[PDB]
């Protein structure tokens, strides 16, 4: 195995394949990448056994086939460390990989390609392509509400749902919920999969937003995404994501419209004096006024009054201000619409101009 | 007490004085700021019993004199969170401090000014003033060599030495040393003072590199620095600091010049395959050539060859590469010079064009 590549052809591949590497890689070959030259294609693979990222770089210069596994972080840093535009020449000499460029020379140990983990062949069931852009908005819009490490392991992930010509992601904690659905331009059978949060972070990071279409294939226990030259395949978590259509409020008769930045600035200032643990802020809404107020254990008090569009009956509701700040930071839009019912129902928040995403935070009795 | 100020006049004071304050100290007043209106002035004071930072801001609007103590971090976040151009009105009411701005209203708990640690009055002994920019040079050129948590408590600090019309700083941890000396244009006594790692981090922090004189007053156990309307005083530490003149190589016969970024890019790359514990590298130096080699337990190796100006005997010398990477990064220059004696002795490194700063790193045996 010998190949010669330009540094810059190796760099974004190498960065991408090194994502899945992480979790205290006890089985040492997982800290390594699989390099294969076959045809005039170098493929690099990296896996954490639950997901896999493959990148292909075509080889225009002379090469010789074979396969081996190099230390990932060390090969990444040597290439990033060489100068811009450098020709890096790799060559496996027996059990060591030789990297030479200009006047530098490196020898890395190799672990055998034949020990590198293989994820099983599986078969596709649903397949569709969509602009990278749509998959980006869908994940960004909701990822913040996924659980992190929960006993309800199925919440540590994101629901991908197809229905009609809509792809829909939903993510929840068990506390707050985010939903985003976008039209995909192809009739699709109804499907639901939960992809593990590590996997949706990796998928998020392979999307550059540029012009290569993203193509996804879904099998019974795996998902695969092909963008240009990279291929990501992860498995799915086994099941029963709660029904998000039940947490949504049933007919909120009250609406409040307000600029996202003003509303965000006032809750971030009121949050400074709320209870550190529970973050409860109390809301009083009345004809064209919103008053936010916060108290904390040491009897300190914050109070914010603002002009809001709201015509309707007066009410109070308290909620955890971190959850609502999270959604106002995900809502990168001019105006926000908050839809309320009463002091004892959840509230829905959306952009006042796109019902595409909907976020629901529960009430707290403060 | 009652005063009214423009957020912008209040904010850099608030940040300079909060900076060092422990969020929740074990003696609570130490997490508050003393606020005093007297004469036409607000003085904000934060201390930790080791140092004290004082800011004054001129009060051009109505005010009423008095003193109180407010939670530092909260007050800073409330002022930072308010819109740009806000006029904040602070009024003491009972044992709450009321902060009003627009329609935002906050009420902060108060601890009494009487309880606030009065630091000690001391007599100045040597005084001099100098460009803020020379002081920031003197400290930046040297601070990365101070020890952090060394048992020889006097190394966790920086020595400021007055001799003639020069001010000098030296820092060392027993393994490498940095010296920087600059003309201050005033005849000074001959005096040395060790100021603590924390006091030099804070003095560097307030040196908003202007035109402005800095006046410094050294006492027997304190140092004070006045720049603008900020006054910083720190206690000093006692021990017998090392003499940099005994550390500096006697007469380095051999000299080598090389471009600093080439030198540095090459040591950062050999560093990748260096033993993780020792970070040891080997230089072989010969006529107009330098070869850097590193290797680790895993039996990986790195080799870099570069062209340098060297006329002199061949030599092999080993260093810890973190120690020379740290001086190449501090030295912000085009060509560097290494002055070597032999394999068993220190090497001096300095900018090839300046001599105000000099760094000596001891060799290793790998």
Any idea what the CATH number is for the domain that residue A359 is in?
3.10.150.10
Same domain, A115 and A12: yes
Decide if B244 contacts B230 (C-beta within 8 A). no
B288 and B344 part of one domain: yes
Cα gap B32→B132, rounded to integer Å:
29
Three-state SS for B278?
coil
Rounded (10°) angle between helices A260-271 and B72-81:
170
Sequence-separated (6 or more) residues with CB below 8 Å from residue B304 = A103, A104, A105, B266, B269, B270, B291, B292, B293
Residues A217, A114 within the same domain? no
Q: Which residue intervals of B82-121 are DSSP H helices?
A: none
Residue finishing a domain among A97, A123, A149: A123
CA pair distance A204, A16, nearest whole angstrom: 11
- Give the three-state DSSP class for A211: coil
Strand ranges across the sheet with B176-196: B157-172, B176-196, B357-361, B347-351, B335-340, B254-259, B309-310
Q: Does B289 touch chain A (CB under 8 A)?
A: no
Identify the residue among B272, B291, B305 best suited for mutation to test binding to A, counting A beta carbons within 10 A and taking the highest: B272
Alpha-carbon gap, residue B91 to B98, rounded angstroms: 5
Nearest-angstrom CA–CA distance, A364 and B142: 54
Within this chain, do residues B177 and B215 fall inside the same structural domain, yes or no? yes
Task: Tally the domains of chain B.
Answer: 3
Which residue, A30, A97, A272, A208, is CA-closest to B79? A272
On the CB side of A170, CA atoms within 13 Å amount to 24
Give chain B's length: 366
Residues 6+ positions from B94 with CB-CB distance below 8 Å: none
Q: Judge: B273–A304 Cβ closer than 8 Å, yes or no.
A: no
In chain B, what is the greatest distance between 2 CA atoms, to the nearest angstrom? 80
> Measuring CA to CA, which residue among B306, B307, B357, B300 is closest to residue B328?
B357
- Whether residue A198 is found in the same domain as residue A285: no
Spatial strand order in the sheet of A41-47: A66-71, A32-38, A41-47, A51-58, A230-235, A222-227, A214-218, A126-130
Q: Do B273 and B289 sit in the same domain of this protein?
A: yes
Backbone angles phi, psi at B200, to 5 degrees: -75, -30
> What does DSSP assign to residue B280?
E
Residue A21 in contact with residue A48, Cβ under 8 Å? Answer: yes
Please check whether residues A7 and A116 belong to one and the same domain: yes
Domain boundary among B123, B153, B172: B123
Burial label, B2 (beta-carbon count in 10 A; 0-12, 13-18, 19+): middle
Measured CA to CA, the distance from residue A226 to residue A224 in angstroms comes to 7
B194 touches chain A (CB under 8 A): no
Q: State both tokens at B59.
A: 């009060």
Q: Which one, of A355, A305, A307, lies nearest residue A331 by Cα?
A: A355
Alpha carbon distances (Å) from A149 to A146, A157, A196, A198, A200: 9, 10, 11, 11, 15
Residues A290 and A259 in one domain: yes
Residues B84 and B99 in one domain: yes
Domain finish residue from B89, B107, B123: B123
Please tell me what DSSP assigns to residue A59: -
Deposited experimental method: X-ray
Contact residues, chain A, for B298 at CB < 8 Å: 109
Rounded-to-integer distance, Cα A174 and Cα A246, Å: 12
Alpha helix ranges (H) inside chain A: 7-17, 72-81, 132-140, 197-206, 244-247, 260-271, 321-330
Is-contact A292 B106, C-beta < 8 A?
no
Backbone angles phi, psi at B210, to 5 degrees: -85, -165
Q: Do A113 and A130 belong together in one domain?
A: no
Is residue A348 a contact partner of residue A339, using CB atoms and an 8 Å limit? Answer: yes
- Give B110→chain A minimum CA distance, Å: 10
The Cα-based distances of B126 to B106, B167, B192 in angstroms read: 45, 12, 11
In this structure, are B252 and B316 located in the same domain? yes
Q: How many CB atoms lie within 10 A of CB B281?
A: 29
CA angle A13, A53, A17 (to 5 degrees): 35
In sequence order, the 6+-apart residues with CB closer than 8 A to the CB of B8 are: B84, B85
- In terms of phi and psi (left: phi > 0; alpha: psi -120 to 50; beta: otherwise), the region of A249 is beta
Of B82, B268, B300, the CB nearest to A269: B82
User: Where do runs of H (alpha helix) occur along B102-239?
Assistant: 132-140, 197-206
Domain of A226, in residue numbers: 124-247
Q: In chain B, which residues have their Cβ closer than 8 Å to the Cβ of A304?
A: 103-104
Please count the other Cβ atoms lying within 10 Å of the Cβ belonging to residue B91: 15
CB contact (8 A) between residue A81 and residue B107: no
| CA angle in degrees (0–180, nearest 5) for B221-B226-B228 | 165
Does one domain contain both B229 and B285? no
Alpha carbons B172 and B143: distance in angstroms, whole number: 9
A321-330 and A260-271 helices cross at what angle (nearest 10)? 150
């Amino acid at each position: 195995m010998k190949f010669t590549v330009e540094r810059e052809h190796l760099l974004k591949p190498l960065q991408q394949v090194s994502g899945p590497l992480g979790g205290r890689p006890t089985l040492p070959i997982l800290g390594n990448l699989l390099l294969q030259v076959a045809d005039g294609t170098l493929s690099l693979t990296g896996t954490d056994l639950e997901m896999e990222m493959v990148a292909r770089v075509a080889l225009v210069q002379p090469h010789e086939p074979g396969a081996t596994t190099v230390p990932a972080r060390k090969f990444f840093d040597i290439c990033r460390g060489l100068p811009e535009g450098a020709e890096i020449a790799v060559q496996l000499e027996g059990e060591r990989m030789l990297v030479r460029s200009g006047r530098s020379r490196f020898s890395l140990s190799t672990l055998p390609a034949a020990d590198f983990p293989n994820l099983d062949d599986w078969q596709s069931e649903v397949e569709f392509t969509l602009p990278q852009a749509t998959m980006k908005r869908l994940i960004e819009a909701t990822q913040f509400s996924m659980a992190h490490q929960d006993v309800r392991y199925y919440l540590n992930g994101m629901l991908f749902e197809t229905e009609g010509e809509e792809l829909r992601t939903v993510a929840t904690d068990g506390h707050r919920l985010a939903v985003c659905s976008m039209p995909i331009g192809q009739s699709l059978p109804s499907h639901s999969v939960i992809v593990p949060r590590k996997g949706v972070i990796e998928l998020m990071r392979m999307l550059d937003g540029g012009d290569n279409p993203l193509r996804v294939q879904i099998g019974s226990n795996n998902i695969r995404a092909h963008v240009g030259d990279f291929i990501f395949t992860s498995k799915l978590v086994d099941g029963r994501f709660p029904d998000y259509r039940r947490v949504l409020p049933k007919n909120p008769d009250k609406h409040l419209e307000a600029g996202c930045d003003l509303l965000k600035q006032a809750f971030a200032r009121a949050a400074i004096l709320s209870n550190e643990k529970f973050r409860g802020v109390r809301l009083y809404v009345s004809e064209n006024q919103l008053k936010i107020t916060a108290n904390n254990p040491e009897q300190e008090e914050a109070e914010e009054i603002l002009d809001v569009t709201y015509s309707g009956a007066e009410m109070e509701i308290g909620f955890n201000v971190s959850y609502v700040l999270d959604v106002l930071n995900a809502l990168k839009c001019e105006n926000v619409r908050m839809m309320l019912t009463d002091s004892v129902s959840s509230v829905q928040i959306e952009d006042a101009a796109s019902q595409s995403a909907a976020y629901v935070v529960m009430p707290m009795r403060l």
